Amino acid sequence: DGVDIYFGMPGEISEHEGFLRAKMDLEERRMRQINEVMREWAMADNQSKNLPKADRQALNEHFQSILQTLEEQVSGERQRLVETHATRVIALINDQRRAALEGFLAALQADPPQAERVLLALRRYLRAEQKEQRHTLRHYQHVAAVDPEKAQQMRFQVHTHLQVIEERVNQSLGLLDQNPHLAQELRPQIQELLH
Amino acid sequence: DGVDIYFGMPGEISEHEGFLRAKMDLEERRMRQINEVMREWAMADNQSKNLPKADRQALNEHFQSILQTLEEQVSGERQRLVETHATRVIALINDQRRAALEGFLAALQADPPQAERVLLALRRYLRAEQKEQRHTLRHYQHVAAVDPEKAQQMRFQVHTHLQVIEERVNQSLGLLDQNPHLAQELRPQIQELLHS
Numbered sequence: 001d002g003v004d005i006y007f008g009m010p011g012e013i014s015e016h017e018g019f020l021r022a023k024m025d026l027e028e029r030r031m032r033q034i035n036e037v038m039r040e041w042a043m044a045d046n047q048s049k050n051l052p053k054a055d056r057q058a059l060n061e062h063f064q065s066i067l068q069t070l071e072e073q074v075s076g077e078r079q080r081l082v083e084t085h086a087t088r089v090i091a092l093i094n095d096q097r098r099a100a101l102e103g104f105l106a107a108l109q110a111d112p113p114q115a116e117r118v119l120l121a122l123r124r125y126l127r128a129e130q131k132e133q134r135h136t137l138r139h140y141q142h143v144a145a146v147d148p149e150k151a152q153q154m155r156f157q158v159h160t161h162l163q164v165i166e167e168r169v170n171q172s173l174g175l176l177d178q179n180p181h182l183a184q185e186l187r188p189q190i191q192e193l194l195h
Numbered sequence: 196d197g198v199d200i201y202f203g204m205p206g207e208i209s210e211h212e213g214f215l216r217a218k219m220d221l222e223e224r225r226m227r228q229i230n231e232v233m234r235e236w237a238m239a240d241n242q243s244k245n246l247p248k249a250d251r252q253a254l255n256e257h258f259q260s261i262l263q264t265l266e267e268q269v270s271g272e273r274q275r276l277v278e279t280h281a282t283r284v285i286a287l288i289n290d291q292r293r294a295a296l297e298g299f300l301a302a303l304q305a306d307p308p309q310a311e312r313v314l315l316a317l318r319r320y321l322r323a324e325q326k327e328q329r330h331t332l333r334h335y336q337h338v339a340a341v342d343p344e345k346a347q348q349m350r351f352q353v354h355t356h357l358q359v360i361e362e363r364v365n366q367s368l369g370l371l372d373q374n375p376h377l378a379q380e381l382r383p384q385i386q387e388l389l390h391s
C-alpha cells in the first residue's frame with residue numbers, strides 16, 4: 001500500500017482527471033455514510049414513538065451530532081482536496097511556461113536560426129503565458145461567482161499579477177531584438193501573433 | 196430574439212449539456228470584460244503617476260467601483276443560472292416519478308394483470324424514487340462540502356425529505372398488496388429491487 005502511494009497516479013492520468021476521480025470517489029463514499037446515518041435515524045424514530053419525551057430529544061441530538069461531525073469531515077476533506085489541486089495546477093502552469101521559455105530560447109540560439117521553429121516555439125511560449133493569464137482571470141471570475149466578499153479582496157492582486165505576465169511577455173519578445181536579421185524576416189509573422 | 200427564446204434549445208441538447216455550455220459562455224464573456232477593465236486600470240496607473248493625490252484616489256475608486264459592479268453582475272448571473280437548472284432538475288424527477296406511477300397503476304388495473312408487466316412498471320417507479328433519493332443525498336453532501344453552516348441548517352429537512360420518499364414507496368407498494376397472489380408471486384423479485 002505504501003508502495004501504491006509511492007507510485008501514485010499513473011502518468012497516463014492528468015492532474016485534472018485524477019482530481020475529479022478522487023472527488024467523485026469521496027462523494028459516493030460520503031453519500032453512503034450519510035444514507036446510513038439517515039436510515040439509522042429513521043429506524044430510531046420509529047422504535048421511539050413509545051418513549052419519554054426527554055429520551056426522544058436525546059435520540060435526536062444523538063443523530064444530529066453524528067451528522068455534525070460527518071459534515072465537518074466532508075468539509076475538511078474537500079478543503080484538503082481543493083488545496084492540493086490548486087497548488088498543483090499553479091506548479092504545472094509555471095513549469096510549462098518555463099519549459100516553453102527554454103524552447104523559444106533554444107530555437108533563437110540555433111546556429112542557423114530556423115524561422116518556422118522559432119515561430120512555433122514563440123507560439124508555444126505565448127500560449128503558456130496565456131494559460132496563466134486565463135487561469136488568473138477565471139479563478140477571480142469564479143470566486144466572484146460564488147463568494148463576493150472574497151472577490152473584492154482579490155482585485156488588487158489580480159490587477160498586479162496580470163501586469164506581471166504582460167511584462168514577462170514583453171521582456172521575452174525582447175530576446176528577439178538580439179538578432180535583427182531574424183527579427184526582420186519574422187516581423188510580420190509575430191505581428192499577426194501579437195493579436 | 197423573442198422568437199428564438201420561445202423555441203428554446205434544440206431537442207438534441209440535454210438540460211445538463213445546455214447548462215454547462217451556458218455556464219461556459221458566460222465565464223468566457225466575463226473573463227474578457229474583466230481583462231479589459233484590468234488593462235484600462237493598469238494604463239491609468241501609468242498615466243497618473245503625475246496627478247494630485249486626490250485625483251489618483253478618485254481614479255482608483257473609479258476602477259474598484261467598476262470591478263464591484265462587475266462582481267455583483269457575475270454573482271447574480273450565476274445565482275440565476277443555478278436556480279434555473281435546479282428547478283429543471285427537480286421538475287424532471289417529479290415528472291418521471293408521476294409518469295412511472297401512472298404506468299405502475301395501469302399494469303395493476305389490467306383485466307388479467309400480468310405479473311411480468313407489473314414487475315417492470317414497479318421497477319421503473321422504484322428507480323424514479325431512488326433517483327430522487329440520490330439527488331436529495333447528493334445535494335446535502337455538496338452543501339456540507341462547501342458550506343458547513345448551511346448544511347447544518349438543512350439537516351432535519353433532508354432527514355424529513357428522505358422519510359417522505361420512503362413513505363411514498365411503501366404506499367405505492369401497498370397498492371400491490373390489494374392483490375395477494377400477484378404480491379406473493381412478485382415478492383422475492385420486489386425484495387431484490389428494494390434491497391438494491
Ligand SMILES: O=C(O)[C@@H]1O[C@@H](O[C@H]2[C@H](O)[C@@H](NS(=O)(=O)O)[C@@H](O[C@H]3[C@H](O)[C@@H](OS(=O)(=O)O)[C@H](O[C@H]4[C@H](O)[C@@H](NS(=O)(=O)O)[C@@H](O)O[C@@H]4COS(=O)(=O)O)O[C@H]3C(=O)O)O[C@@H]2COS(=O)(=O)O)[C@H](OS(=O)(=O)O)[C@@H](O)[C@@H]1O
Nearest residue numbers: 014015016082089092135138139140142143146218337341
Ligand atoms: O474550490 C472550488 O471553488 C472548486 O469549484 C468547482 O470547481 C471549479 C474550479 O475550482 C475552477 N478553477 S478556477 O481556477 O477557479 O477557474 C474552474 O475549473 C475549470 C477551469 O477551466 C480549470 O480549473 S483549473 O484549476 O485547472 O484552473 C479546469 O479546466 C480543465 C478542463 O475542464 C478540462 N476539460 S476536460 O474535458 O478534459 O475535463 C481540461 O481541459 O483540463 C482543464 C485543466 O487543465 S489543467 O492545466 O490541468 O489545469 O477545470 C475546469 C472545471 O473543472 O470546470 O471551475 C470549476 C467548476 O466551477 S463551477 O462551475 O462549479 O462553479 C468544484 O466545486 S464542485 O463542482 O465540487 O461543486 C470543485 O472543484 C471545487 O469546489
